[PDB]
């Protein structure tokens, strides 16, 4: 019940989703962004995912309270910072994504890597997950997915991904 969240994350109207660690299906969450409280349903999925409704462009502080039966049971110790993109920045991000998709057709890694470079860590995570789902053996790039999970503080996912990486190292002829 030591929930942590990303220290810094970029979101935008095109990529509005925030993610944090699922503390257990018994728990709901209250996501607080600059004093506005959002009631987040409990989930049994691999992570908690919440579409942030439109914020004003710029920096916003957020924290998360863990709740059980509507009662606070835990809380982020340090919050994080959301940077919400302006209309102009979001148009550029959207054009960059389009450029990368045109130039590297079907390449989910290239897409994830571009989004990652702009701080759009949840969208980078989605693209990377697609990449590794179809190129499970691309171990050299896997640390970027590991780092993404680590940045979002998705502890279990990070541990699992690290185990995949190690098992793939260990599969090398002669290694173990």
Author numbering: 136 to 311
Article sentences:
Magnetotactic bacteria (MTB) are a heterogeneous group of aquatic microorganisms that share the ability to orient themselves along geomagnetic field lines. Previously in the alphaproteobacterium Magnetospirillum gryphiswaldense, the MtxA protein (MGR_0208), which is in or attached to the magnetosome membrane, was identified by a comparative genomic study as “MTB-specific. Because of its co-localization with putative signal transduction proteins within the same operon, mtxA was suggested to play a role in magnetotaxis. The MtxA protein probably has an importance in periplasmic or extracellular interactions that could act as a sensor or mediating interaction with other proteins or even activating signals in the bacteria.
The proteolysis with trypsin yielded a smaller and stable domain that generated crystals of excellent quality, which diffracted to 2 Å resolution. Furthermore, the residues seen in the electron density maps are L136-S311 (L142-Q313, MtxAΔ1−141). The overall structure of MtxAΔ1−141 has two distinguished domain architectures: I- Ig-like fold (MtxA-Big) in orange, and II- TPR fold (MtxA-TPR) in green. The first domain—MtxA-Big: L142-L226 (MtxA142−226)—has a common Ig-like fold consisting of seven β-strands forming two antiparallel β-sheets, which pack against each other forming a β-sandwich. The second domain, MtxA-TPR S227-N313 (MtxA227−313), contains five anti-parallel α-helices-and-turn motifs folded as tetra-trico-peptide repeat (TPR) motifs. MtxA-Big and MtxA-TPR contact each other extensively in a parallel orientation with a buried surface of 558 Å2. The MtxAΔ1−141 structure displays two protein monomers in the asymmetric unit. The two monomers tightly contact each other with a buried surface area of 418 Å2. The hydrophobic patch that covers the whole face created by the TPR and the Ig-like domains may indicate for an interface for interacting with other proteins, since TPR and Ig-like folds are known to be part of protein-protein interactions.
